[PDB]
Amino acid sequence: KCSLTGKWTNNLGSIMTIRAVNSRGEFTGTYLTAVADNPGNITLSPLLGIQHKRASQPTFGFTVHWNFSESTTVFTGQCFIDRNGKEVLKTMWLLRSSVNDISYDWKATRVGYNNFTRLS
Amino acid sequence: KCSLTGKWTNNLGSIMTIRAVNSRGEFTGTYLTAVADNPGNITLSPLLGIQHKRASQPTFGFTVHWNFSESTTVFTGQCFIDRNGKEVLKTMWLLRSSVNDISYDWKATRVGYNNFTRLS
Amino acid sequence: KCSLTGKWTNNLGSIMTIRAVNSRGEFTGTYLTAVADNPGNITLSPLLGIQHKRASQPTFGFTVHWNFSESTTVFTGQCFIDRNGKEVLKTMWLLRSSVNDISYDWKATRVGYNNFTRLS
Amino acid sequence: KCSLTGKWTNNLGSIMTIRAVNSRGEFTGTYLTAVADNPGNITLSPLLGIQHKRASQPTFGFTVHWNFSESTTVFTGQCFIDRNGKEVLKTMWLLRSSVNDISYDWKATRVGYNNFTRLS
Numbered sequence: 001k002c003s004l005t006g007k008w009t010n011n012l013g014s015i016m017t018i019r020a021v022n023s024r025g026e027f028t029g030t031y032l033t034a035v036a037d038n039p040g041n042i043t044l045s046p047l048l049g050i051q052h053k054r055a056s057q058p059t060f061g062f063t064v065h066w067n068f069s070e071s072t073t074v075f076t077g078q079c080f081i082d083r084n085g086k087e088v089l090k091t092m093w094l095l096r097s098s099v100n101d102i103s104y105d106w107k108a109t110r111v112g113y114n115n116f117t118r119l120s
Numbered sequence: 121k122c123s124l125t126g127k128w129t130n131n132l133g134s135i136m137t138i139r140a141v142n143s144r145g146e147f148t149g150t151y152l153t154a155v156a157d158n159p160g161n162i163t164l165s166p167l168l169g170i171q172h173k174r175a176s177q178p179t180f181g182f183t184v185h186w187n188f189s190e191s192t193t194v195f196t197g198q199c200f201i202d203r204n205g206k207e208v209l210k211t212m213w214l215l216r217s218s219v220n221d222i223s224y225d226w227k228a229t230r231v232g233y234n235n236f237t238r239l240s
Numbered sequence: 241k242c243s244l245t246g247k248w249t250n251n252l253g254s255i256m257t258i259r260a261v262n263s264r265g266e267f268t269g270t271y272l273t274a275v276a277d278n279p280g281n282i283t284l285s286p287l288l289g290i291q292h293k294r295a296s297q298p299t300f301g302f303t304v305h306w307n308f309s310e311s312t313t314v315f316t317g318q319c320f321i322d323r324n325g326k327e328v329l330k331t332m333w334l335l336r337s338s339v340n341d342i343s344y345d346w347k348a349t350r351v352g353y354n355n356f357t358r359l360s
Numbered sequence: 361k362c363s364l365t366g367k368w369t370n371n372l373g374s375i376m377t378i379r380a381v382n383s384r385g386e387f388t389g390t391y392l393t394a395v396a397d398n399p400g401n402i403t404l405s406p407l408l409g410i411q412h413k414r415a416s417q418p419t420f421g422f423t424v425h426w427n428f429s430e431s432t433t434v435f436t437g438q439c440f441i442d443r444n445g446k447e448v449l450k451t452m453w454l455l456r457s458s459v460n461d462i463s464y465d466w467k468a469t470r471v472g473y474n475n476f477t478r479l480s
C-alpha cells in the first residue's frame with residue numbers, strides 16, 4: 001500500500017514532507033518549493049490533504065497555503081507502485097493567485113504537472 | 121471580509137457546508153455533488169482545506185475525498201465580496217480518477233470551473 | 241445542427257467572428273479580447289481551428305495568435321443547441337505566456353473557461 | 361529560430377509531423393497518438409495551428425481533429441533552444457470529449473502535459 005507519509009522530491013527540485021495518514025486518509029505536512037514568482041521570499045509552507053485508504057495505489061489531493069504570498073496551490077494525483085516496489089506520485093496542480101476584484105478572476109489560475117519520487 | 125464558513129451552492133446544483141475556519145485558515149466540511157460518473161452512487165463526502173486568514177478576499181484550496189468512488193477532486197479559488205456584501209467563490213477544479221498503472225496516467229485528470237454562492 | 245460560423249460573445253465581453261467552415265471542418269476568424277495582461281495594447285488577433293463536421297453538437301478547437309503579445313491561447317469545447325435552437329459554446333482554454341528559458345516553464349500556462357453565445 | 365516544422369516525438373511515444381510554417385505562423389501537420397480511449401481505433405489525424413514568427417523561442421498552439429473519435433485536443437506551449445542548440449517543446453493540452461447534452465459538460469475536458477523532442 002502506497003501511503004503519502006515520508007519525504008518526496010519533484011522534477012522541479014521541490015521537497016515535501018508528509019506526516020502520518022489517519023484512518024480517514026487525512027494528512028498534514030510541509031512543502032519547500034524550489035521555484036516561486038518571487039523566489040527570494042520562499043519559506044517552508046504547510047499542506048493539508050486527503051488520500052484514499054483502501055486502495056494500494058490511492059488517489060489523493062492536498063492544498064498548500066504558501067506562507068510568503070497570498071496564493072494557494074492544490075495538487076491531485078495518484079501513487080503508483082512499480083513491479084520493483086518503487087513509488088511515484090503523478091500529479092497535476094492549480095496555482096491560484098490573489099487578484100484585486102472579480103473582474104480580474106480570468107487571469108488568476110495557473111496549471112501544471114509534477115512527478116514526485118521518495119527522497120530516500 | 122469574505123468568509124468561507126457556511127452553506128454554499130454551485131452552478132451545477134452541488135452544495136457544500138464548511139465549518140469554522142481556525143487560526144491557521146484550516147477548515148473541514150461536507151460536499152454533496154449533484155453530478156458524478158455514477159450518480160446513483162452519490163453519497164456525502166468530506167472536504168478539508170486551507171484559506172488565507174488576513175486577506176479580505178482570500179484565496180483557498182480544498183480536497184474532496186469522494187466516499188463513493190476512488191476519485192479525488194481539488195478546488196482552488198478566491199472569495200470575492202461585491203459592493204452590497206454578496207459573496208461569490210470563483211473556483212477551478214481538478215478531478216483525479218484512479219487508473220490501473222502509470223501508463224494510463226495521461227487520461228486521469230479532468231478540469232473545470234465552479235461558481236459558488238451562499239445558500240440563504 | 242450547431243454551427244460555429246458567425247459572430248459570438250463570451251462571458252468576459254470578448255467577441256469573435258468565425259468564417260465559413262470547410263469540408264475538413266477547418267475555420268479562420270478574428271478575436272477581440274475584452275481583457276489582457278496589458279489591455280491598452282489589445283489589437284484584433286487571428287484564430288485558426290478545426291471542428292468535427294458530422295456531429296450535430298460538434299467538438300472543436302482553435303488557436304488565437306495574439307497580435308499584441310508573445311502569448312498564445314487555445315480554446316476547446318462543444319457547440320450545444322437547446323430545445324429552442326439557441327446555441328452555446330462551452331469552452332475551456334489554456335493561455336501560454338513566453339518565458340525566458342525552460343527553467344521558468346512551470347509558470348507559463350494559465351487555464352480558464354468561457355461560455356459563448358451568438359451575437360444577434 | 362525554433363520552427364515547428366519537422367517530426368517530433370513526445371514522452372508518451374506519440375509522433376507528430378509539422379509542415380512548413382507560413383509568414384503568419386500558421387502550420388498544418390499530422391499526429392499519430394500512442395494512446396487513446398480506444399487504442400484499437402487510432403488513425404493518423406490532422407492538426408492545424410499557429411506559432412509566433414519573430415521570436416526565437418516562440419509560443420504556439422494547435423488543434424488535433426481526431427479522425428477516429430468525436431473528441432478534439434488542443435496543445436499550447438513554447439519551443440526552447442538549449443545552449444547546445446537542442447530544441448524541446450514544452451506543452452500542455454486540453455482533450456475535449458463529446459457529451460450528449462449540456463448537462464454533461466462538466467465532465468468533458470481532460471488536461472495534461474507533453475514534452476516533445478525532434479525525431480532526428
Ligand SMILES: O=C(O)CCCC[C@@H]1SC[C@@H]2NC(=O)N[C@@H]21
Pocket residue numbers: 010012014033034035036037038066068069070071073093095112114346
Ligand atoms: O509563487 C508563489 O507565490 C507560491 C509558490 C508556487 C510554487 C509552484 S506550486 C506548482 C509548482 N510546483 C512546485 O513544486 N512549485 C511550483
Ligand SMILES: O=C(O)CCCC[C@@H]1SC[C@@H]2NC(=O)N[C@@H]21
Pocket residue numbers: 130132134153154155156157158186188189190191193213215232234466
Ligand atoms: O464522479 C465521482 O466519482 C466523484 C464526483 C465528482 C463530481 C465533480 S467534482 C467537479 C464538479 N463540481 C461538482 O460540484 N461536481 C463535479
Ligand SMILES: O=C(O)CCCC[C@@H]1SC[C@@H]2NC(=O)N[C@@H]21
Pocket residue numbers: 106250252254273274275276277278306308309310311313333335352354
Ligand atoms: O493578455 C494577452 O497578452 C493576450 C490576451 C489573453 C486574453 C484571454 S484568452 C482567455 C480569456 N478569454 C478571453 O476572451 N480573454 C482571455
Ligand SMILES: O=C(O)CCCC[C@@H]1SC[C@@H]2NC(=O)N[C@@H]21
Pocket residue numbers: 226370372374393394395396397398426428429430431433453455472474
Ligand atoms: O482518445 C481519443 O479519442 C483521441 C486521442 C487522444 C490522445 C491524447 S491527446 C493528449 C495526450 N497526448 C498524446 O500524445 N496523446 C494523448
